[PDB]
Amino acid sequence: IASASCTTXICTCSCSS
Amino acid sequence: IASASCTTXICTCSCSS
């Protein structure tokens, strides 16, 4: 439901460091 | 055809930094 870099269907994932 | 964080169909996108 939230995070960065880390799912399959909604929208986050990853994206920096 | 390659990168990180940045396309729609093949497989990269983003994910670290």
Swiss-Prot record, chains A, B:
Post-translational modification: Maturation of thiazole and oxazole containing antibiotics involves the enzymatic condensation of a Cys, Ser or Thr with the alpha-carbonyl of the preceding amino acid to form a thioether or ether bond, then dehydration to form a double bond with the alpha-amino nitrogen. Thiazoline or oxazoline ring are dehydrogenated to form thiazole or oxazole rings. Maturation of pyridinyl containing antibiotics involves the cross-linking of a Ser and a Cys-Ser pair usually separated by 7 or 8 residues along the peptide chain. The Ser residues are dehydrated to didehydroalanines, then bonded between their beta carbons. The alpha carbonyl of the Cys condenses with alpha carbon of the first Ser to form a pyridinyl ring. The ring may be multiply dehydrogenated to form a pyridine ring with loss of the amino nitrogen of the first Ser.
Covalent cross-link 4-(1-hydroxyethyl)-7-isoleucino-2-(threonin-O3-ylcarbonyl)-7,8-dihydroquinolin-8-ol (Ile-Thr) as placed by the record, residue numbers: 1-12
Modification sites for 2,3-didehydroalanine (Ser): 3, 16-17
Subcellular location: Secreted
Crosslinked residue numbers (Thiazole-4-carboxylic acid (Ser-Cys)): 5-6, 14-15
Modified residues ((3S,4R)-3,4-dihydroxyisoleucine): 10
Sequence position, cross-link Thiazole-4-carboxylic acid (Thr-Cys): 12-13
Linked residues for Thiazole-4-carboxylic acid (Ile-Cys): 10-11
Post-translational modification Serine amide, affected residues: 17
Residue(s) carrying (Z)-2,3-didehydrobutyrine: 8
Signal peptide: none
Cross-link 5-amino-piperideine-2,5-dicarboxylic acid (Ser-Ser) (with C-68), sequence positions: 5-14
Sequence position, cross-link (4S)-thiazoline-4-carboxylic acid (Thr-Cys): 8-9
Covalent cross-link (5-amino-piperideine-2,5-dicarboxylic acid (Ser-Cys) (with S-69)), residues: 5-13
Protein family (similarity comment): Belongs to the thiocillin family.
Function noted in UniProt: Has bacteriocidal activity. Inhibits bacterial protein biosynthesis by acting on the elongation factor Tu (EF-Tu).
Record's protein name: Thiostrepton
Organism annotation: Streptomyces azureus
Lineage: Bacteria, Bacillati, Actinomycetota, Actinomycetes, Kitasatosporales
